[PDB]
Design a protein around this nucleic acid. Structure first.
Ligand SMILES: [Mg+2]
Ligand SMILES: [Mg+2]
Ligand SMILES: [Mg+2]
Ligand SMILES: [Mg+2]
Ligand SMILES: [Mg+2]
Ligand SMILES: [Mg+2]
Ligand SMILES: [Mg+2]
Ligand SMILES: [Mg+2]
Ligand SMILES: [Mg+2]
Ligand SMILES: [Mg+2]
Ligand SMILES: [Mg+2]
Ligand SMILES: [Mg+2]
Ligand SMILES: [Mg+2]
Ligand SMILES: [Mg+2]
Ligand SMILES: [Mg+2]
Ligand SMILES: [Mg+2]
Ligand SMILES: [Mg+2]
Ligand SMILES: [Mg+2]
Ligand SMILES: [Mg+2]
Ligand SMILES: [Mg+2]
Ligand SMILES: [Mg+2]
Ligand SMILES: [Mg+2]
Ligand SMILES: [Mg+2]
Lengths: 100, 206, 142, 48, 140, 84, 141, 8, 72, 62, 68
RNA sequence: GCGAUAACGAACGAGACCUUAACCUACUAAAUAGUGCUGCUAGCAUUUGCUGGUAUAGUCACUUCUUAGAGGGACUAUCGAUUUCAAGUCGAUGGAAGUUUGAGGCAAUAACAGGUCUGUGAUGCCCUUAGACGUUCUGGGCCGCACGCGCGCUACACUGACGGAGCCAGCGAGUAUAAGCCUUGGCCGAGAGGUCUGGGAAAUCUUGUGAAACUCCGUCGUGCUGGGGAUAGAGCAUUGUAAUUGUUGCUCUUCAACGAGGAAUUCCUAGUAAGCGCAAGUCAUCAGCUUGCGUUGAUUACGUCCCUGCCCUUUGUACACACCG
């Protein structure tokens, strides 16, 4: 047995929720007790620049955004089982870190 | 009338509020009546309130202001001239103290004096301008009951504000003198000079 | 409670060659003396055991001499050095607190001492301009 | 008074005795081209 | 356990969570009696849900609220809403619904904000001005 | 790191390929009208709902001008411009 | 019923604990209380020169009572106010550190406070005993 | 905008 | 600069206060200043004692406003 | 001698800036002598607005 | 104002000309019905279309409507 | 949009759309959120109660609040008036929400001698190219002061200043062998600040950012006064290689105009205006500035074309580089 934490971060929620559900799915048919996923409060990375490359015109501003969504999943399983779950649910957008 | 024993003890005076809702738990709306048929529907005293602070939505529709309590409309007009905008608790304190001063003076019901000062302060005919693109022209027109009521509150608080400026007399007791004098129709009070001066000019335009 | 007195009030006081209104409260009456601010006057009154609830004329001569003694000798009455007007004096290096007539004299002496060496700060004092680096393009219109 | 520091303490600021100028604004056909090189229809025809 | 209902009232940002258990007439603000809620001049705003129905309704219930967020005035309005909603929610669950409809009538007939949270929120600020609608002063 | 090169399936539907292809034609001296219509018809031939080509600059004239060469149906405002 | 600190108004509880704490006399008052300003944002020293230190210690004790291990830096933030910057806008500035640190040190050796684990200063075993006592002797009148 | 003239 | 309100209480004003203040419908800090020509600070101390002496009944208590009335 | 006249019909906005309204008034006593008059403030029907002088009609304002 | 546009006015009257027997005078039933009759990309447009179809249905029962 | 109709039926733009805010005791879970219970534990009355602390093993429970994903919900819904009985509008009732539900993002057909080659290893041409107009080093300037003007910040006091006491937000940011991030807690120091440890690459720590107005109790008492805090002197620290032309911060002293502002003129219709602060950006240091955020929170319309700009229709034209003709 091993208390293992899996942290999921990505910018887009569709691939994030697929990986999140897929990990939960593999922790269900395998009789592994789980806690999660925990939807962490999303982070809005905001950058407000001036539209004008020069300094002439009405003072108009862009407001760019970069939402970061974070999910943490707690697993009680041996380390070999949890790591192979990660390769099952590998997605280009979502990065995975595994901590005991 | 029975005194209700709670685990959290409740003061005697506030338990008396179960019988009746009174302004600041001191002033009753039951014996208050508007001595003018034309402003009954625009001076709202039928729904009693404890404190003149309701934080309601009276600016959404057109005539919702007529549904705001008359004392709350009065305390709203006190907080003016920049440094007082948004200071409603200060305004409520002034009104609460003003009513007590209006009570020790003339001994009447303080909110009755407030109602009397409002009916006597709204000009019944104001001379609107009909200037044709710059030239000076004035025409005498009638004044709606809503504008008649809310110009009384505007004039009553403006007069109280200026009487307390650079004066040792406090604003609460400048308002009490302003409200008491206008209630009895005395021309000494501000907002009665203004009301007379408005209706005097309107007489010279019809 | 309200108390009464006769003949003891003094309408006009004269302290350090300055006329003091006797009906002003003592802490703020002493502020008329140049070189004595509210913060300094508040402390000399507490060092002289003069309770602040008294008007200037209420004070007796015994208290008045006790105050002018303290203002002229602050360090001798456990008044901290950092609280003083003129600390680390230029010539003798001791902590001082200049008062009504001494203030403009030693303020002057600082100006020529700056002007004698012809420092930039001393020069700008001579011209009547602002010396602390303020912009004079648009506000120096007096 | 060769050094500027020495002379500064001797030059007086005689500024309040002279009056400011009454006006001080000192900062036009944009539609008419001033290049003087007109474009012929052949050049527009060949390019576009 | 016992007869417990948990509710909440809201103003602009202030939110007051009320726990209503069966007991004696205990009514506390952050562990402190309601008779000393500040500011004093708005103390009757939280007395309204009490004196409107009569304190006899609180014999069998004790109320402990925890109010956080918002401001001084906004917290008072959150508390009075939590009390009024808490009393109604207890009646709906452990008393006949005839009384709950009775309680809801006096509260609604007096002030809508006693039961319905005010939906007004602060408008976002837009560039080109110091406020939501206000703009920088223009000069010609 | 491993790099793989993959061919774009629909050259007519890739504005990057069409812009690079158009640039390789304009730098060869082909006329703008013949060059612009070579991508207008190529885009529609691939099945595009719409296509618009704008070429701006100066061409044998001191004054500069811009010419738009549209085709088919084009949407301009709202979210769908980020999708289609 | 058991009276607590939370059952008495703060303004008149502090006025009662300050009077008791001064008459008890065991609180050690530093020698600069007649000189110092409470905060760098203040412009004048307290008007109640003889008693201001006692009342502030009473306020500090009550404030620590209702919370858990509040430090002295938080006390500077608590008693700080808006500074009167001349033409620039107002700003929040913390109160003086020594006055608060001396108060908690004075209260810690009188038996009301102690160093709490993981920082701050908890209220003492006897700190509850004597504050809750003053609360009872505050509201009987 | 200026013509750099040398002295040394 | 015309106020010149009296701040020191002599004997002529003291008994005049106790003979005139009771015959007032409403007394306050400004009322005492306005009609007795005494200063505001002297008015505040006069009110706090006159209430202790029973001449004056406190209608309402507040720092910024003191509403008082006759006790007779 | 003021006379009260309930309004029964809001005709329309008149005046140069639209700040004055044509309205149709009906007297409280002697429910006749219906007159058209101009009013400054906001007006609904059934306003008991009183008239300082009654013997005057109203027309469009310039 | 609350003036419905042409994308909702004409699309709603196509429903009446096509599914009048299955329609009704209830918005809630119409709202569910138009979700199985038309492919609506957004819920807000679905409610607008069903809300105007109900208004037209309520108007047909009071007499003949012009254009449908 | 209704409608009138030599037009009919359409497309772009508007609207739809997307993001955000408001509702959900209805789902899905949460030791990086909260609560009730339960252990253990404290104080006060002893009534079994009331406030706490503790519990990453009490190896509890739950999702009301908190977080966020899947959805639901509003479509002007129902009912009265008016209307060409049409589009609609105005009233009520219900509702979380009935101003396009609030706010934004995106945004047509052409075009401007609008602004930038001082953002670009974006650029054509002209100029310069070794005593350089390249690059770098040192010092100064961009701040310079008889003046006119604009964006703002403090104020002219008592609806206030001080002095104590009460004590409530939201949006965010945060590091490693650096070149040093956010920094609690303890101890010194009147302060500013210094010093020793620890936490945090973060819903975990800074941080409940205990913000300011605000509220209570006192002093002041209409006085250029305890309003206001320029100007200036002396001193103490911080950043930086370097503070002089004061970077900034702190202490004492100095106590200026200003006592509500002419002709004119700006912004604004509801959580809005106005106050009131806070964060992020610039940033070694410096915010009277912007970009946002929240606290307190109104007066007055909810109308018109009277002024002003723009749009449309008719009309005149010797204009079409289009009246700067
Ligand atoms: Mg201010
Ligand atoms: Mg479109
Ligand atoms: Mg759009
Ligand atoms: Mg604070
Ligand atoms: Mg404070
Ligand atoms: Mg100030
Ligand atoms: Mg929930
Ligand atoms: Mg409703
Ligand atoms: Mg919109
Ligand atoms: Mg140009
Ligand atoms: Mg600007
Ligand atoms: Mg204060
Ligand atoms: Mg560290
Ligand atoms: Mg927070
Ligand atoms: Mg001052
Ligand atoms: Mg002064
Ligand atoms: Mg600089
Ligand atoms: Mg900054
Ligand atoms: Mg800038
Ligand atoms: Mg309009
Ligand atoms: Mg016009
Ligand atoms: Mg023509
Ligand atoms: Mg021609």
């Amino acid at each position: 047995i091993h208390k293992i934490r899996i942290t999921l971060t990505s910018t887009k929620v569709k691939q994030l929720e697929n990986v999140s559900a897929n990990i939960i799915r593999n922790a269900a048919q395998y009789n592994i007790v789980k806690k999660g996923p925990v939807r962490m409060p999303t982070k809005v990375l905001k950058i407000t620049t001036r539209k004008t490359p020069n300094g002439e015109g009405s003072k108009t501003w862009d407001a760019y955004e970069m939402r970061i969504h974070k999910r943490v999943i707690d697993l009680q399983a041996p380390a070999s089982t949890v790591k192979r779950i990660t390769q099952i649910t590998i997605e280009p957008g979502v990065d995975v870190e595994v901590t005991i | 009338l029975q005194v209700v024993e709670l685990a959290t003890t409740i003061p005697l005076d506030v338990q008396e509020a179960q019988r009746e809702v009174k302004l600041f738990n001191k002033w009753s709306f039951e014996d208050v009546e508007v001595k003018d048929v034309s402003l009954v529907d625009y001076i709202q005293i039928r729904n009693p309130v404890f404190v003149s602070h309701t934080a309601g939505k009276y600016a959404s529709k057109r005539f919702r202001k007529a549904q705001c309590p008359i004392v709350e409309r009065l305390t709203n007009s006190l907080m003016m001239n920049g440094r007082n905008n948004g200071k409603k608790l200060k305004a409520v304190r002034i009104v609460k103290h003003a009513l007590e001063i209006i009570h020790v003076l003339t001994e009447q019901n303080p909110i009755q004096v407030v109602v009397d000062a409002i009916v006597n302060s709204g000009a019944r005919e104001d001379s609107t301008r009909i200037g044709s693109s710059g030239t000076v022209r004035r025409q005498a027109v009638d004044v709606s009951p809503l504008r008649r009521v809310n110009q009384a509150i505007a004039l009553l608080t403006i007069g109280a504000r200026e009487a307390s400026f650079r004066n040792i007399k406090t604003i609460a007791e400048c308002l009490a003198e302003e409200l008491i004098n206008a209630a009895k129709g005395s021309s000494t009070s501000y907002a009665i000079k203004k009301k007379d001066e408005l209706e005097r000019v309107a007489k010279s335009n019809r | 409670l309200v108390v009464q007195e006769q003949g003891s009030f003094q309408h006009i006081l004269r302290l350090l060659n300055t006329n003091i209104d006797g009906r002003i409260k003592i802490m703020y009456a002493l502020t008329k003396i140049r070189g004595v601010g509210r913060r300094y006057a508040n402390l000399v009154c507490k060092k002289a055991d003069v309770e602040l609830t008294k008007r200037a004329g209420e004070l007796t001569q015994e208290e008045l001499e006790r105050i002018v003694t303290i203002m002229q000798n602050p360090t001798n009455y456990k008044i901290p050095a950092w609280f003083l007007n003129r600390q680390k004096d230029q010539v003798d290096g001791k902590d001082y607190h200049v008062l009504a007539n001494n203030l403009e004299s030693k303020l002057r002496d600082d100006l020529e001492r700056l002007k004698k060496i012809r420092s930039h700060r001393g020069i700008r004092h001579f011209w009547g301009l602002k010396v602390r680096g303020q912009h004079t393009k648009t506000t120096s219109r007096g | 008074k060769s050094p500027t520091g020495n002379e500064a303490a001797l030059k007086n600021k005689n500024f309040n005795k002279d009056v400011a100028p009454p006006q001080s604004t000192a900062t036009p056909f944009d539609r008419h081209s001033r290049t003087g090189k007109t474009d012929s229809k052949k050049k527009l025809q060949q390019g576009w | 356990s016992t007869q417990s209902v948990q509710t909440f009232g809201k103003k602009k940002t202030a939110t007051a969570v009320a726990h209503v258990k069966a007991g004696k007439g205990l009514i506390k603000i952050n562990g402190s009696p309601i008779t000393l809620v500040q500011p004093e001049i708005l103390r009757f705003k939280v007395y309204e849900p009490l004196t409107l129905v009569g304190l006899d309704k609180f014999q069998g219930i004790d109320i402990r609220v925890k109010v956080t967020g918002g401001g001084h005035v906004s917290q008072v309005y959150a508390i009075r809403q939590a009390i009024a909603k808490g009393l109604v929610a207890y009646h709906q669950k452990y008393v006949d619904e005839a009384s709950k409809n009775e309680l809801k009538k006096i509260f609604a007939s007096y002030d809508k904000t006693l039961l319905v949270a005010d939906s007004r929120r602060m408008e976002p600020k837009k560039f080109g001005g110091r406020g939501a609608r206000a703009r920088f002063q223009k000069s010609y | 790191i491993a790099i793989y090169a993959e061919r774009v399936e629909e050259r007519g539907l890739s504005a990057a390929v069409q812009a690079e292809a158009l640039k390789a034609k304009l730098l060869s001296g082909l006329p703008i009208r013949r060059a612009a219509y070579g991508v207008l018809r190529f885009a529609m031939g691939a099945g595009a709902k719409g296509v618009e080509v704008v070429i701006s600059g100066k061409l044998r004239a001191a004054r500069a001008k811009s010419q738009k060469y549209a085709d088919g149906f084009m949407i301009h405002s709202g979210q769908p411009t980020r999708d289609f | 019923p058991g009276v607590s600190v939370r059952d008495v108004p703060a303004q008149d509880f502090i006025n009662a604990y300050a009077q008791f704490l001064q008459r008890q006399g065991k609180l050690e008052v530093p020698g600069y209380v007649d000189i110092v300003k409470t905060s760098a944002g203040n412009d004048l020293p307290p008007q109640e020169a003889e008693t201001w230190f006692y009342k502030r210690a009473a306020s500090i004790a009550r404030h620590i009572y209702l919370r858990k291990q509040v430090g002295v830096g938080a006390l500077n933030k608590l008693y700080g106010g808006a500074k009167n910057r001349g033409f620039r806008p107002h700003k929040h500035v913390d109160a003086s550190g020594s006055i608060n640190r001396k108060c908690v040190q004075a209260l810690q050796k009188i038996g009301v406070l102690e160093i709490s684990p993981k920082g701050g200063r908890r209220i003492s075993e006897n700190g509850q005993r004597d504050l809750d006592r003053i609360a009872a002797q505050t509201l009987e009148e | 905008r200026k013509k750099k003239v040398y002295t040394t | 600069d015309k106020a010149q309100h009296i701040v020191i209480l002599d004997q002529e004003k003291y008994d005049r206060i106790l003979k005139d203040v009771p015959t007032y419908k409403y007394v306050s800090v400004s009322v005492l200043v306005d009609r007795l020509k005494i200063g505001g600070s002297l008015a505040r101390v006069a009110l706090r004692q006159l209430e202790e002496d029973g001449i004056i009944t406190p209608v309402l208590k507040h720092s910024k406003q003191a509403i008082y009335t006759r006790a007779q | 001698p003021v006379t009260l006249a309930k309004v029964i019909k809001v005709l329309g906005r008149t005046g140069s800036r639209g700040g004055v309204t044509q309205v149709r008034v009906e007297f409280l006593e002697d429910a006749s002598r219906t007159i058209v008059r101009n009013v400054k403030g906001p007006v609904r029907e059934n306003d008991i607005l009183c008239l300082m002088e009654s013997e005057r009609e109203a027309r469009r304002l310039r | 104002g609350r003036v419905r546009t042409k994308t909702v006015k004409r699309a709603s009257k196509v429903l009446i000309e096509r599914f009048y027997p299955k329609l009704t005078l209830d918005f809630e039933t119409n709202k569910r019905l138009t979700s199985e009759i038309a492919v609506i990309q957004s819920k807000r447009l679905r409610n607008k279309i069903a809300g105007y179809t109900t208004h037209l249905m309520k108007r047909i029962q009071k007499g003949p409507v012009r254009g449908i």
